[PDB]
Amino acid sequence: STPIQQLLEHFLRQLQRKDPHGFFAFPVTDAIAPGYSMIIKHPMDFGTMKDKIVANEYKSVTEFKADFKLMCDNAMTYNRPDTVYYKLAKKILHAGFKM
Numbered sequence: 001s002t003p004i005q006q007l008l009e010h011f012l013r014q015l016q017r018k019d020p021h022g023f024f025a026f027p028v029t030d031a032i033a034p035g036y037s038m039i040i041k042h043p044m045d046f047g048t049m050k051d052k053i054v055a056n057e058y059k060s061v062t063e064f065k066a067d068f069k070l071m072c073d074n075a076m077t078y079n080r081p082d083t084v085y086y087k088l089a090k091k092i093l094h095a096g097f098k099m
């Protein structure tokens with residue numbers, strides 16, 4: 001466990017606490033969200049981010065934040081504003097930017 005890995009695992013744990021039901025914690029399927037794989041060119045989720053930490057693909061907190069922002073932007077693009085997914089993506093994007 002390197003310092004960067006420890007730091008990012010801490011950040012990821014705090015972010016996921018804002019998503020207790022795992023809206024953003026798994027690879028979305030077209031069966032769940034028809035059209036998703038065509039609309040969202042660069043999908044991202046917390047499970048994939050955890051794997052990228054372990055593979056040590058993040059060389060910076062800025063890279064980690066880029067993936068988090070991507071995850072949130074994707075959810076706010078596919079889902080209409082009056083949905084639980086858009087609303088939670090917006091709230092955790094803002095709260096993640098704090099830390």
Ligand SMILES: CCN(CC)CCNC(=O)c1c(C)[nH]c(/C=C2\C(=O)Nc3ccc(F)cc32)c1C
Pocket residue numbers: 023024028032033036040074075076078079085
């Ligand atoms: C007929 C469909 N109805 C009109 C929209 C509502 C039904 N909607 C549903 O069932 C549904 C469910 C149960 N999950 C999602 C989508 C996502 C999810 O869970 N995590 C995500 C993360 C990113 C993202 F971009 C989409 C999702 C939908 C659309």
